């Protein structure tokens, strides 16, 4: 699908059975959700933008579906105020920013 | 152009004469750039992003020529710690995420 910025890029996601809502950030480097469970081993990170910086959990090779779309990659978890779709797996579902 | 996300989305932009490069971030609602004069009148305000908030001056009707497409719309000027194109603008361009 073609999306236009005139509203937030909002699309479902798919993720550890659970279902969400997520931005399209081409803004963002990484992958930053919400407090969840997610299987396999995590490392403490600490991810920053505008205001500061939060302490999340880093789960590698993650599986999740976004708008129907697969991808495999790593998944923040932490505190954040959005769920955000990074570039590591927006490249995954082979998104372009066209104007 | 299209562009693709292996790397960040960085273009170049020309705004009171001054040349800079920013993110076309889908996740930014509004534009937000680092310190510099923008002539013209402003009014205090605070965004807040993944980690914490920021005190910016917000600049109304302001002209940017983002990678050679021009556009008029409102500038938040502050520590952000990246210049962000926001969809505030992105819109202006027409630029649209496809996958
Ligand atoms: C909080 C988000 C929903 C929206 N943000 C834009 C987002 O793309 C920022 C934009 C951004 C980019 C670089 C530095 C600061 C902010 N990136 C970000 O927070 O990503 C973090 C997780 O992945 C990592 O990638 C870099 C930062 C980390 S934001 O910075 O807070 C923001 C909020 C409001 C406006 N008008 C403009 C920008």
């Known amino acids: 699908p ?5 509203k937030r890029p909002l699309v479902t996601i798919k993720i550890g059975g659970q279902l969400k809502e997520a931005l399209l950030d081409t ?6 959700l919400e407090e969840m469970n997610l299987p396999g081993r ?3 990170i600490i991810i920053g933008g505008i ?3 939060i302490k999340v959990r880093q789960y590698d090779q993650i599986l999740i579906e976004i708008c129907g779309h697969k ?3 790593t ?3 932490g505190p954040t105020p959005f769920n955000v779709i ?3 797996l927006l490249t995954q579902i082979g998104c372009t920013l066209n104007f």
Chains 1, 2 share one sequence.
């Not at 073609?2 to 005139?6: N, P």
């Not at 803004?27 to 930053?32: F, P, S």
């Open 2 to 6: 073609q999306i236009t910025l005139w």
């Open 27 to 32: 803004g963002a480097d990484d992958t930053v």
């Open 42 to 44: 995590w490392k403490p």
């Open 51 to 53: 205001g500061g910086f």
């Open 71 to 73: 991808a495999i990659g």
């Open 75 to 77: 998944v923040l978890v």
């Open 86 to 88: 990074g570039r590591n």
